[PDB]
Amino acid sequence: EVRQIAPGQTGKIADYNYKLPDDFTGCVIAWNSNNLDSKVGGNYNYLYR
Amino acid sequence: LGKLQDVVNQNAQALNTLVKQLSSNFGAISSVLNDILSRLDPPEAEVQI
């Protein structure tokens, strides 16, 4: 769900759940989060869609 | 009256081609800017417009 996060690039996240201006911007960087193997985390843990 | 009918003729037909340009869509999808913005999402429609 991180591929679509780009200026002007669409995606429901970018549609409703996460902001994205299509003008001047710094940039989008990312790297995997191997640090997350807790499959449940005893919680709900994320809000998206 | 050619020497003046011609003047009014040049005038008119000039105005004529002037408006008629708006047929020319210049490799858009449309010749009505309204149509094409309603065709696309903002970003690509930007350079298209």
Swiss-Prot record, chain B:
Changing D6N: In strain: Delta/B.1.617.2, Mu/B.1.621. It comes from the Viruses. Changing L37F: In strain: Omicron/BA.1. Residues 5-49 form a coiled coil. Subunit of the fusion protein that is processed upon entry into the host cell. Mediates fusion of the virion and cellular membranes by functioning as a class I viral fusion protein. Contains a viral fusion peptide that is unmasked after S2 cleavage. This cleavage can occur at the cell membrane by host TMPRSS2 or during endocytosis by host CSTL. In either case, this triggers an extensive and irreversible conformational change that leads to fusion of the viral envelope with the cellular cytoplasmic membrane, releasing viral genomic RNA into the host cell cytoplasm. This is Spike protein S2'. The gene is S. The chain holds residues 945 to 993 of 1273 of the full protein.
